[PDB]
């Protein structure tokens, strides 16, 4: 174990990431950045950072009645705002750019030409 | 698969946001011109 | 794969297309006005 009571229960039917500390004790106090993020909710031992898409990033510590469990660092890049810069996508972006800029400039040409 | 759909959807969202901002600055310009005319 | 968020991406793209179409109509209508 080596004081690494923290483990993650993942791949649920509903997409979420759950962190569980292997302690059946009251007031298991998880620490964030060396300070308690929150004392244990009554009767519930595990903390739920949220869904997998949120991509929580930080240093997570856990402490039960005994000394603090040695922290388990969690890194998630479960990419959400991620696109591909393939030839087709950049070409389409530049093409929409070109037609938009040209149409807007044509409107400007006429708008200046009349007045 | 559906991942490719995620990528193309967010790419389109960003592109349309840029186009909307373009047309909005053009709207500001043409509103200035109309107000000067009126 | 979870379709929940990608369905919002599709819906928001649809909403942005509505906004862009309406706004293009706006610029064209105003240009026609300034010509008339």
């Amino acid at each position: 174990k080596g004081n690494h009571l923290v483990k993650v229960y993942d791949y649920q039917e509903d997409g979420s990431v759950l962190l569980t500390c292997d302690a059946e004790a009251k007031n298991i106090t998880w620490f964030k950045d060396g300070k308690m993020i929150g004392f244990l909710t009554e009767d519930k031992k595990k903390w739920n950072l949220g869904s997998n898409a949120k991509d929580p990033r930080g240093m997570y510590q856990c402490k039960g009645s005994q000394n603090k469990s040695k922290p388990l660092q969690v890194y998630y890049r479960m990419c959400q705002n991620c696109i591909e810069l393939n030839a087709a996508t950049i070409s389409g972006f530049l093409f929409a750019e070109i037609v938009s800029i040209f149409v807007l400039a044509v409107g400007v040409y006429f708008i200046a030409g009349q007045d | 698969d559906t991942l490719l759909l995620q990528l193309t959807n967010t790419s389109a969202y960003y592109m349309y946001l840029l186009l909307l901002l373009k047309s909005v600055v053009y709207f500001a310009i043409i509103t200035c011109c109309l107000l000067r005319r009126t | 794969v979870h379709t929940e968020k990608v369905n919002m991406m599709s819906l928001t793209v649809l909403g942005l297309r509505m906004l862009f179409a309406k706004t293009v109509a706006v610029n064209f209508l105003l240009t026609a006005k300034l010509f008339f």
Binding site: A88, G92, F95, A96, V99, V103 | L5, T8, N9, A12 | R17, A21, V24, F28, A32
Partner: peptide
């Protein structure tokens, strides 16, 4: 694939509709 075709037809048909309304108003003059 299909979303890209949808967006391409968006751009083409936007240009077409703007051109057609423009030239229709031209004849309207």
């Amino acid at each position: 694939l299909d979303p890209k075709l949808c967006y391409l037809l968006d751009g083409i048909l936007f240009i077409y509709g703007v051109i057609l309304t423009a030239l229709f108003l031209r004849v309207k003059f």
